[PDB]
Design a protein around this ligand. Structure first.
Ligand SMILES: *[C@@H]1O[C@H](CO)[C@@H](O[C@@H]2O[C@H](CO)[C@@H](O)[C@H](O)[C@H]2NC(C)=O)[C@H](O)[C@H]1NC(C)=O
Ligand SMILES: *[C@@H]1O[C@H](CO)[C@@H](O[C@@H]2O[C@H](CO)[C@@H](O)[C@H](O)[C@H]2NC(C)=O)[C@H](O)[C@H]1NC(C)=O
Ligand SMILES: *[C@@H]1O[C@H](CO)[C@@H](O[C@@H]2O[C@H](CO)[C@@H](O)[C@H](O)[C@H]2NC(C)=O)[C@H](O)[C@H]1NC(C)=O
Ligand SMILES: *[C@@H]1O[C@H](CO)[C@@H](O[C@@H]2O[C@H](CO)[C@@H](O)[C@H](O)[C@H]2NC(C)=O)[C@H](O)[C@H]1NC(C)=O
Ligand SMILES: *[C@@H]1O[C@H](CO)[C@@H](O[C@@H]2O[C@H](CO)[C@@H](O)[C@H](O)[C@H]2NC(C)=O)[C@H](O)[C@H]1NC(C)=O
Ligand SMILES: *[C@@H]1O[C@H](CO)[C@@H](O[C@@H]2O[C@H](CO)[C@@H](O)[C@H](O)[C@H]2NC(C)=O)[C@H](O)[C@H]1NC(C)=O
Ligand SMILES: *[C@@H]1O[C@H](CO)[C@@H](O[C@@H]2O[C@H](CO)[C@@H](O)[C@H](O)[C@H]2NC(C)=O)[C@H](O)[C@H]1NC(C)=O
Ligand SMILES: *[C@@H]1O[C@H](CO)[C@@H](O[C@@H]2O[C@H](CO)[C@@H](O)[C@H](O)[C@H]2NC(C)=O)[C@H](O)[C@H]1NC(C)=O
Lengths: 147, 117, 47, 49, 19
């Protein structure tokens, strides 16, 4: 996505929630609640990619395995894209598919009500659209509970 | 096989936009494909509803979307605007107006109404 | 008069969707376009 | 692209059940997807022809 | 408008069915 779509100001996606999927507006990070958990659960050996010479200048160099690797010419390079930038791309994807669905891409993003987006997806599965409207409250609850 | 010898329906295959057709061309050590795709253009915002309330029953688009301008409701296919009158043959009918959230009031046209008599 | 400039990356451009629950955007025209893709098939064979 | 930007019709793609929609979430060194699917339930049998 | 269109009567049984 080259169009970074902002998280919609309107949360009225029928009866659906998605607040744990969408970026947290109160967090400096652009991660959603679930994303913040994913980041907290995967453990990285270290972070920030900067160690100054003076920081390992002592017995400590033998305890810090990464510094020990640096002293033998082995280094680690930073990624070009940051965690924040990735969160911005996932944010755009979520904003796009939550408000335009299929039509957020393959051209300009064209808005559509959420319930309709799912009605078309159901027709795609082979389920009449009437099921969604009849059970719209049920479906939203099943989704919200699944999340 | 899927872009030249068939029409891929995969959304991100055969380039960007909707796939229509393609033509291969050879190159040293490889293949270059020419992918012909369709990109929708000049969209406008129309008011919409999941159903039309007629006699208390709910009428749902047989295909397309039920949309409106300042005075009329009409049905159009979703990927290219072509407004048509909503008729009883352009819609599925079920349930009622108290089931569908967002249903609107619009008389649905019956094509056999004159009864030829 | 010229120099190496450091700057942050853009991510394309900023956009948004109105998302009215009462409105749908519908195309009224289209463009058929042709784009290309280049894919390697073979290596120089050696011995 | 196939699960988020569009609706995949491949039977075993985007998780199990019939694909309805999905939402990507990032993770260190990768992507984690939330795949929302539809699964029919509570079948009853009827006579057919 | 249609390029390649041909002349052929299209059948409609409604009046015979009505009377
Ligand atoms: C989605 O559901 C959550 C509950 O899971 C709602 O947030 C809660 O709001 C109450 C106050 O009314 C707080 O005490 C809880 O701690 C909140 N929970 C969480 C996880 O934040 C949230 O408002 C709902 N969002 C939408 C869009 O429906
Ligand atoms: C399918 O079965 C589910 C239960 O397995 C029904 O949903 C629940 O119904 C009870 C009342 O009997 C409510 O208290 C629950 O809150 C409902 N669940 C949710 C997520 O809302 C559901 O109605 C049945 N569906 C059909 C079409 O019969
Ligand atoms: C909404 O669309 C309808 C067509 O579906 C427009 O109705 C036509 O208006 C013209 C005048 O500009 C008349 O000459 C036609 O006879 C009308 N057609 C029908 C079927 O009634 C209508 O004007 C549009 N409304 C708005 C507010 O733009
Ligand atoms: C979209 O949201 C609007 C509110 O922003 C809903 O408007 C309500 O429509 C009912 C119709 O019977 C009125 O009685 C309410 O007073 C309206 N609310 C407000 C705040 O004005 C509209 O129904 C929603 N549409 C869909 C499809 O969900
Ligand atoms: C379509 O119009 C009818 C009236 O001709 C609406 O039915 C009445 O709505 C009022 C509130 O505005 C209620 O006080 C009456 O009791 C309703 N009549 C009956 C017989 O129940 C109907 O709701 C409108 N439908 C839509 C989708 O807008
Ligand atoms: C859909 O309607 C909106 C107006 O509600 C049109 O204009 C844009 O509206 C958004 C709010 O959702 C603003 O943030 C933009 O700044 C408005 N555009 C401009 C140039 O000021 C929008 O263009 C309409 N969509 C279509 C396809 O016609
Ligand atoms: C389909 O009909 C059968 C027969 O009435 C139901 O019961 C099963 O019958 C087969 C023999 O044809 C037995 O081998 C199974 O052990 C029976 N099932 C049970 C639970 O005892 C069967 O339940 C019906 N299917 C549905 C969905 O109702
Ligand atoms: C079907 O037959 C009619 C004649 O009965 C054709 O109409 C005429 O076509 C000639 C050219 O061959 C024109 O010069 C006349 O002006 C047309 N008549 C009228 C009243 O417009 C019609 O084109 C034929 N259609 C097809 C598909 O073959």
């Amino acid at each position: 996505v080259k169009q970074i779509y902002k998280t919609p100001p309107i949360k009225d996606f029928g009866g659906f929630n998605f607040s744990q999927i969408l970026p947290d507006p109160s967090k400096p990070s652009k991660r959603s609640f679930i994303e913040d958990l994913l980041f907290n659960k995967v453990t990285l050996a270290d972070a920030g990619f900067i160690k100054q010479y003076g920081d390992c200048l002592g017995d400590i160099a033998a305890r810090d395995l990464i510094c020990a690797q640096k002293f033998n010419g082995l280094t680690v390079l930073p990624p070009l894209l940051t965690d924040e930038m990735i969160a911005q791309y996932t944010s755009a994807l979520l904003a796009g598919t939550i408000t335009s669905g299929w039509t957020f891409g393959a051209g300009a993003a064209l808005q559509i009500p959420f319930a309709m987006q799912m009605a078309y997806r159901f027709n795609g599965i082979g389920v009449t659209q009437n099921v969604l409207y009849e059970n719209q409250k049920l479906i939203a609850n099943q989704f919200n509970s699944a999340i | 096989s899927e872009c030249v010898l068939g029409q891929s329906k995969r959304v991100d295959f055969c380039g960007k936009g909707y796939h229509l057709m393609s033509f291969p061309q050879s190159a040293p050590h490889g293949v270059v494909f020419l992918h012909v795709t369709y990109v929708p253009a000049q969209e406008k915002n129309f008011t919409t509803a999941p159903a039309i309330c007629h006699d208390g029953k709910a009428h749902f688009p047989r295909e397309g979307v039920f949309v409106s301008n300042g005075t009329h409701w009409f049905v159009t296919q979703r990927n290219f605007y072509e407004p048509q009158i909503i008729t009883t043959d352009n819609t599925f009918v079920s349930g009622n107006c108290d089931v569908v959230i967002g249903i609107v009031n619009n008389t649905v046209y019956d094509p056999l109404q004159p009864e030829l008599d | 008069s010229q120099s190496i400039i450091a700057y942050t990356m853009s991510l394309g451009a900023e956009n948004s969707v109105a998302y009215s629950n009462n409105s749908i955007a519908i195309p009224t025209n289209f463009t058929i376009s042709v784009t290309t893709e280049i894919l390697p098939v073979s290596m120089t064979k050696t011995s």
